[PDB]
Amino acid sequence: LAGTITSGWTFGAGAALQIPFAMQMAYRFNGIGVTQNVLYENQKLIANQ
């Protein structure tokens, strides 16, 4: 859990790399077909949910 929140998916495939969580969500959103802009703009709302 600690690795996932801080390093995203980097720890699984190699030495862990630190990335901001907000940024990690943007990357993850990209994977599902939703653009990065939606996450930052709705970051307050997404966090609440």
Partner: peptide, 25 residues
């Protein structure tokens, strides 16, 4: 360039290179 500069929590004022405009001129 989607969005306006009030909705992001983390931001910086770095200048965009904007390479395309000079060529058009």
């Amino acid at each position: 360039v989607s969005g306006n500069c009030d909705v992001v929590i983390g931001i910086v004022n770095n200048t965009v290179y904007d390479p395309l405009q000079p060529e058009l001129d």
